[PDB]
Amino acid sequence: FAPSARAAELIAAVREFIDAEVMPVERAVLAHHDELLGARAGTTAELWHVPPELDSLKAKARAAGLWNLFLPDPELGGGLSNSEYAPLAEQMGRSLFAPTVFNCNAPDSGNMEVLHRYGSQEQKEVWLEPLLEGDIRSAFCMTEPDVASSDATNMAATAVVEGDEVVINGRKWWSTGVGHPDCKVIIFMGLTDPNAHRYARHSMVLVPMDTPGITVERMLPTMGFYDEPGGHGVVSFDNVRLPADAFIAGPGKGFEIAQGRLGPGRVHHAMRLIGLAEVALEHACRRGLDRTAFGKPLVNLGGNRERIADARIAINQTRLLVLHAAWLLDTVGIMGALSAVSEIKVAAPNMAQQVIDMAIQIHGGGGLSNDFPLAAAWVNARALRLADGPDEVHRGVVARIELAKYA
Amino acid sequence: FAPSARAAELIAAVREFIDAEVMPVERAVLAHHDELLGARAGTTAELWHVPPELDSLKAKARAAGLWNLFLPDPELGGGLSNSEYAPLAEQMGRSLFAPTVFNCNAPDSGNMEVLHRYGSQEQKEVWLEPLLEGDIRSAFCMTEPDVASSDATNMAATAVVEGDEVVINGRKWWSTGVGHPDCKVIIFMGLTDPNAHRYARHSMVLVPMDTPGITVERMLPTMGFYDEPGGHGVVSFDNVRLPADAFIAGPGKGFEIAQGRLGPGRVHHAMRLIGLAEVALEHACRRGLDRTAFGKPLVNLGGNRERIADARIAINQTRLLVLHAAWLLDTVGIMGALSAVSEIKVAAPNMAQQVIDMAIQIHGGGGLSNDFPLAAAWVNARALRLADGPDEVHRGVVARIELAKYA
Amino acid sequence: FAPSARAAELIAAVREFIDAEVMPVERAVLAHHDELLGARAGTTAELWHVPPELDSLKAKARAAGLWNLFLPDPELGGGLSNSEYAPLAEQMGRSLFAPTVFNCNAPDSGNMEVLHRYGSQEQKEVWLEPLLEGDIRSAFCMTEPDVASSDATNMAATAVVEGDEVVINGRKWWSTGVGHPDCKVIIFMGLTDPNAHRYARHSMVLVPMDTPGITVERMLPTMGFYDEPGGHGVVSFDNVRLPADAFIAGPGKGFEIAQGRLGPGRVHHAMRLIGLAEVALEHACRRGLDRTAFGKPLVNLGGNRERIADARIAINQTRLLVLHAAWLLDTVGIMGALSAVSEIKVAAPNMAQQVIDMAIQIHGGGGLSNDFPLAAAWVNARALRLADGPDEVHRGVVARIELAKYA
Amino acid sequence: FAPSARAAELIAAVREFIDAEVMPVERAVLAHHDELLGARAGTTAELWHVPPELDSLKAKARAAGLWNLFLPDPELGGGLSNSEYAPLAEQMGRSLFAPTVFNCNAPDSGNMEVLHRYGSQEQKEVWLEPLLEGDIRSAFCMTEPDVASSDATNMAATAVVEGDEVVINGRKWWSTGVGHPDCKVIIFMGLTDPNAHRYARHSMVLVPMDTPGITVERMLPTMGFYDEPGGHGVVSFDNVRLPADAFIAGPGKGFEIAQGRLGPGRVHHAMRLIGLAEVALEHACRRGLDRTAFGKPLVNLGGNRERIADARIAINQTRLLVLHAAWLLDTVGIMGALSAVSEIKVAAPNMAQQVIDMAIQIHGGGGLSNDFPLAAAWVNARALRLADGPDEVHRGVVARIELAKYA
Numbered sequence A, B, C, D: 001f002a003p004s005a006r007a008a009e010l011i012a013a014v015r016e017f018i019d020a021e022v023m024p025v026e027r028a029v030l031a032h033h034d035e036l037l038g039a040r041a042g043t044t045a046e047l048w049h050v051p052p053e054l055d056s057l058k059a060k061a062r063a064a065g066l067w068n069l070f071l072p073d074p075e076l077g078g079g080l081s082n083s084e085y086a087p088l089a090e091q092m093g094r095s096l097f098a099p100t101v102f103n104c105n106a107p108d109s110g111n112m113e114v115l116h117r118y119g120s121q122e123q124k125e126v127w128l129e130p131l132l133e134g135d136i137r138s139a140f141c142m143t144e145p146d147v148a149s150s151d152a153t154n155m156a157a158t159a160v161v162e163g164d165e166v167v168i169n170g171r172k173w174w175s176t177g178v179g180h181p182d183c184k185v186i187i188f189m190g191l192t193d194p195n196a197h198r199y200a201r202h203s204m205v206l207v208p209m210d211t212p213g214i215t216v217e218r219m220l221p222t223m224g225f226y227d228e229p230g231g232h233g234v235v236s237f238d239n240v241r242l243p244a245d246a247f248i249a250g251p252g253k254g255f256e257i258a259q260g261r262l263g264p265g266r267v268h269h270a271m272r273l274i275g276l277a278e279v280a281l282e283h284a285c286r287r288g289l290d291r292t293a294f295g296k297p298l299v300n301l302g303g304n305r306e307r308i309a310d311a312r313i314a315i316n317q318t319r320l321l322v323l324h325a326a327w328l329l330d331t332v333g334i335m336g337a338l339s340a341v342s343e344i345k346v347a348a349p350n351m352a353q354q355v356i357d358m359a360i361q362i363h364g365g366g367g368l369s370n371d372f373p374l375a376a377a378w379v380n381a382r383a384l385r386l387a388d389g390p391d392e393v394h395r396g397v398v399a400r401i402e403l404a405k406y407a
């Protein structure tokens, strides 16, 4: 239940950095965005500018040793176990920009993990190194608009071998980060040989964004939020051709890569949602103590204290479920954590959604505005019931594993 | 349980008009908005243009006799009872623009009701007539950002008599519609004499928007949605002075006006939410039958049919609770419907929120986008747990009335 | 929304009779049962004695014209439409004994309906007449312990034609009422010819309880409650042989009988649950106003008023869903109410369970005792999520019918 | 997250003993109880006989070193930390008799803790020693029927000093265990001096059950269950007089004793509920895999796998919340676990209630019977939302502590 000496030091360092360095910039960026739209002024394009202060924050973070903390390689990353990194991800979850500032954000962290493990020497030199430096961004392109992508076997976009080339065709969407000016490379997942054995029909391909035949068609909203500057895009691939060396690991290894990498990412997202919920609960308590109606602080009205209690309980038990999952990954590996990594995927976004909805209510109309981070937070938690696989698919995993115990 | 001959005719006429005339325009407007933002193109200001097709739709509606259907006055409105109008409001709730097209939208419908009942002959000639014609828009300004406005007694913005003038000072927000270019008049609610008897301390004032000292400070988002072209604004009043004839009814009558008008508005909103939920359920069923994953239509997976059943039940029982409320208003009046008009205010938005969240989930990632109306619908239902008084305040009314039975 | 003159008269008469005549006896019977068990005294067998006061209450009810009110035949019953009887069933739901006192209790009401519609002249003379007089009781034997009886096609108990006899074998359980000393006849449902067309494989048989080969094996608890004096039994049939005239309608007509009778029964049960919930809410309000803790009446603590409000809303909307179902049965018949009769089956017991659980909580420890009717009420509502088909099966019906609209 | 070597050994030993030794007896006892009542046979009094096999099981447990495992004193108990004992309590929670067999049952464990810490040398020799040996039982008498005892300051039963005696008057109820033939002593909590300082107005008194003026008035049901042989009683005290040495610690120390003992008991109950929920989930999975309807195992129908997943998640996160609470008690003591010990009190019974209700449903009608332990389990979890203080009071504690962080 207690963290290592290193973890305790880093929790304090990360939280201090976020509150002192990141949050003033974060508040300023969000306020300026709100001011422009509130004034019905300016261009749409200017809302997508990368905040200049981010590179300055990244540099400061690097100088403080707060960089690549997600990556367990001690030479290239922070060397942290899952149990050590978990509480750091919670702290980063309290801030929109924090994961980026520490180079720990999705999808880049997951893509770096894929390249570190499965990339060729050249792929690592050309693409992993600039990602590790924070000099470029990437995206992971798996979901397809025209098929129900919650079942990966439905993928119809293709990456096929023709002579010494890989040839890529299709359309992907919800690609996080592709709107960013420095998103220079894509990991494309698609169908290769439908007649191969099950589990060997798909591939991942490393695709530079400047390859002819790629089009970022449009950016997508989540309840009206565009998540600038990286956004979530639609990407089409029309006769995109690369050297066959562009495959990651090789043709047919798509499923193996996904399974091989599974676990840490689920912990990272789930821990960020704990942080998000804490920020929401904190806002709820402050607002509810400060505002008065019907002769009382709002918190003292009706069921509000019961709601606060329920949120405290919910956060705490979910946090512990996630920390336990990290401990399993550290001790028994993914083979001993297969249920846990789906349990936390269901639990965390659902818990956060309910805490945040309670916090919004306590703020009245203002809760739905962007004068507070709650409205954006709600959408974030809601989206995480779908991103990386819907709740229902993960419940299916948990049920299957439970029922297998009775055979 | 059955409607009048007139109501049956109008249900068919309104639904036909919405599907044939309104929805093609509605889809085009929403698509164009989405296309501009998706392309990261254009100005923010152009998103606020009033769709030119609305005046054409309003004219067609008027020509068909589908106009002012909310208003029970048979000369100036449709002459409909609450029971007759209720199912029409449900049909209008299926469409973003429909209430405007039939001149039945909030806040204008409520403001017209106030002026019809309490307006002087001159107020009715100058302001009610253009509202009834659909030539201008209005807003209702009661909520104040710096106080918890769920308790109306907290109002600190003032409308005070000084000689032959009324003098208005303060700040209001969440004023629906004030962004519209044709929003020409405001009904301001504020504190007049704090030392008067309880219930006689507040007033409503008819305030032309071009009066010196009024500033629309900014427009407000609800989860990133701005609800163009009318929006939701912040309005400040700095030494705004009008002839004392600008009071509606007279100084101190604010609470009396509010209580006197109570009932129909609650039915209108609650019925629109039934329509909104039906549209969401319909989308869920279509999508769930058409999309396939894990060997099955999505609807056939896991608990999805149970979710569909629960939504059907929820919509149906809530609809009937609202229709019953309309029947009470028609037979025993507001004095016999005091609990019912708060019951429906709690029930309808909570029911719709849950149906819509279920529908979004079934759509996968696309459910959160504006390729479908579900994301906007969710925010609409969520907001209606706060607009016109939070859930909690209305539960308080219902509880008080129930407990009074045991005295 | 308003009832007929007859219905209004009967609502008042039934409620008056229940409160003045039935409830003093009901309270005395329950108190005596509680006193014996609380004292760890007496025999188990004496708890099953039929309260002598019931025949006196039945006679008084008959004399007042409050008899067979469920049965629409105006000669043999009350002549009431479903809409007229519905509010009477609500009033009866407020009392454990009331349905019996008015001869409107399940399973006898359903069995009388079957015999009235499908019985031969002789079956009606021998068995329907004494049931209509309240002189005997009956039971309906369909559910089988060794198969999942929620799917009627699983029935393995048999009723087969051999020459001029019907031969019955198998085991049934949860047979309501078979413990009663005057339970003289059973309607047995079983498999007849598995090779017949679908829907023509099952039969209902009228089986006198004194037929050789019938054994009432044991009585069953529902959370420790035995529901004396009728209880819920296990009944075995070993080479039970009757004249082939004992079939109701004829061999193979089991499904037709069930479908033909469907609707009114669902309304009766659902309306009784509305009454049950009202009694629970009333207890909650009285107790919560009278008891004081932490300086306040219990109702004024925490979320209790919100809970009271939610119960009022839940009861009211569910009531209206059921009254609407009765109206459909009266106007369009079962063919136009197929979804509604399953909607109410899901809605009513789930609503009542939650209201009752809230009421129990407000009573503290005493809520779980039989010093109040709440504990027994909870079990009643809980059981009605299973009796006459589980929630899930009924959700399946509702979903199927909804989805069929989009074909 | 891992247990000590001792804890791992004892988890295996306790679980093995329960499954091999306790459960055959437990099943036989419950079956015999069910058989008698099902046959409408025998006396009520015979249902209260102490199963003879318990003393044999206690002796075997003692011989195996599985005795007084709750008590941290290494001479008199097992010497276990809270973290070590917690998983043992979970295993005991799987069985009705297990806590008694290991001498770890409430209320005796809590009473032993009180005497160990606060008892005089003589009180420990006369009463603690026979309790530690399992030779007698005890009860804790605090709750009073005529006042809302959720607020301890409402206590109106008195224990007052008159000369060299303590004089006790009043009525207590829900006293667990007082029906047992070997319940020889009571810890009475009552009002002593209402004019003393807050927190010094109440006392605990050690009261032999054979003292003149004590009457066990009646035993109480929880949904029809009497929890033989100890039950839950009503106890009246009429001019009960004892030497003033009968006070535990001294007059006025009632609140101090309660606060001083707080923590371990909450962990014990919460861990037992985890075990109870696991037994329910296990039953649900077995039944759902074995029974078939509509062409499928029941588990494969509708939302049942989602329900199984949700139960697995709920159990797991709640377990971890409780284990964390035990770790806090071991490291920072009750002063650092004040919120946690109320969080687990809310969380565990609510979690178990929902898992059990799901399990009952999957069993169909049989789920409500005592052919399985689920019906009794439901009542146990439900009761634990009230026993040792209602959910609402504990939510109040959690909220207060959370809100204090923002001062």
Ligand SMILES: Cc1cc2nc3c(=O)[nH]c(=O)nc-3n(C[C@H](O)[C@H](O)[C@H](O)COP(=O)(O)OP(=O)(O)OC[C@H]3O[C@@H](n4cnc5c(N)ncnc54)[C@H](O)[C@@H]3O)c2cc1C
Binding pocket: A107, A140, A141, A142, A143, A144, A147, A148, A149, A150, A151, A173, A174, A175, A176, A222, A232, A383, A384, A386, A387, A388, A389, A390, A391, A392, A393, A396, B291, B293, B294, B298, B301, B302, B303, B304, B361, B362, B363, B364, B365, B366, B368
């Ligand atoms: C914020 C956000 C960021 C994203 N980022 C990325 C990204 O970076 N890269 C990327 O490739 N994708 C991304 N996605 C896409 C996301 O992973 C998919 O939306 C998700 O996997 C569901 O796929 P789908 O949208 O095709 O939905 P579909 O598969 O069409 O529908 C899924 C729905 O079907 C139902 N369903 C499916 N299986 C079951 C079951 N077993 N039981 C019951 N119901 C079931 C559920 O209602 C489920 O929600 C992102 C999505 C969001 C919202």
Ligand SMILES: Cc1cc2nc3c(=O)[nH]c(=O)nc-3n(C[C@H](O)[C@H](O)[C@H](O)COP(=O)(O)OP(=O)(O)OC[C@H]3O[C@@H](n4cnc5c(N)ncnc54)[C@H](O)[C@@H]3O)c2cc1C
Binding pocket: A291, A293, A294, A298, A301, A302, A303, A304, A361, A362, A363, A364, A365, A366, A368, B107, B140, B141, B142, B143, B144, B147, B148, B149, B150, B151, B173, B174, B175, B176, B222, B232, B383, B384, B386, B387, B388, B389, B390, B391, B392, B393, B396
């Ligand atoms: C879409 C939208 C449109 C709107 N349009 C208009 C408009 O046109 N004109 C206008 O004047 N206003 C408008 N409003 C404002 C709206 O009516 C207010 O936001 C609402 O009345 C709450 O007031 P508040 O925002 O000051 O919240 P506060 O009063 O600060 O906080 C309210 C919260 O306090 C708590 N609370 C309050 N009372 C109780 C209680 N009895 N028990 C328990 N908890 C309680 C609840 O959490 C409640 O949600 C609009 C709001 C929205 C979202």
Ligand SMILES: Cc1cc2nc3c(=O)[nH]c(=O)nc-3n(C[C@H](O)[C@H](O)[C@H](O)COP(=O)(O)OP(=O)(O)OC[C@H]3O[C@@H](n4cnc5c(N)ncnc54)[C@H](O)[C@@H]3O)c2cc1C
Binding pocket: C107, C140, C141, C142, C143, C144, C147, C148, C149, C150, C151, C173, C174, C175, C176, C222, C232, C383, C384, C386, C387, C388, C389, C390, C391, C392, C393, C396, D291, D293, D294, D298, D301, D302, D303, D304, D361, D362, D363, D364, D365, D366, D368
């Ligand atoms: C108080 C009471 C009185 C009763 N009275 C009578 C009586 O008088 N006469 C009589 O014949 N019977 C009676 N019954 C029996 C009752 O009708 C059955 O218990 C019920 O139909 C379920 O059948 P089963 O018990 O065999 O459960 P099973 O069929 O073994 O299990 C049913 C469970 O399976 C699951 N399930 C089934 N279908 C689906 C689906 N489509 N989707 C998801 N899950 C599903 C659900 O968990 C459901 O609860 C009574 C029961 C009770 C509790």
Ligand SMILES: Cc1cc2nc3c(=O)[nH]c(=O)nc-3n(C[C@H](O)[C@H](O)[C@H](O)COP(=O)(O)OP(=O)(O)OC[C@H]3O[C@@H](n4cnc5c(N)ncnc54)[C@H](O)[C@@H]3O)c2cc1C
Binding pocket: C291, C293, C294, C298, C301, C302, C303, C304, C361, C362, C363, C364, C365, C366, C368, D107, D140, D141, D142, D143, D144, D147, D148, D149, D150, D151, D173, D174, D175, D176, D222, D232, D383, D384, D386, D387, D388, D389, D390, D391, D392, D393, D396
């Ligand atoms: C199985 C069982 C075993 C028991 N064993 C014992 C025993 O061994 N010894 C013993 O002394 N007692 C025992 N009890 C009694 C138990 O501790 C009390 O029932 C409980 O403390 C509640 O007290 P009360 O019954 O007087 O309820 P009351 O105080 O009359 O009512 C309590 C209810 O009031 C409401 N309420 C109270 N406070 C709040 C708040 N802050 N916010 C909102 N609502 C609130 C809630 O609805 C709460 O449930 C047992 C009870 C049960 C069910």
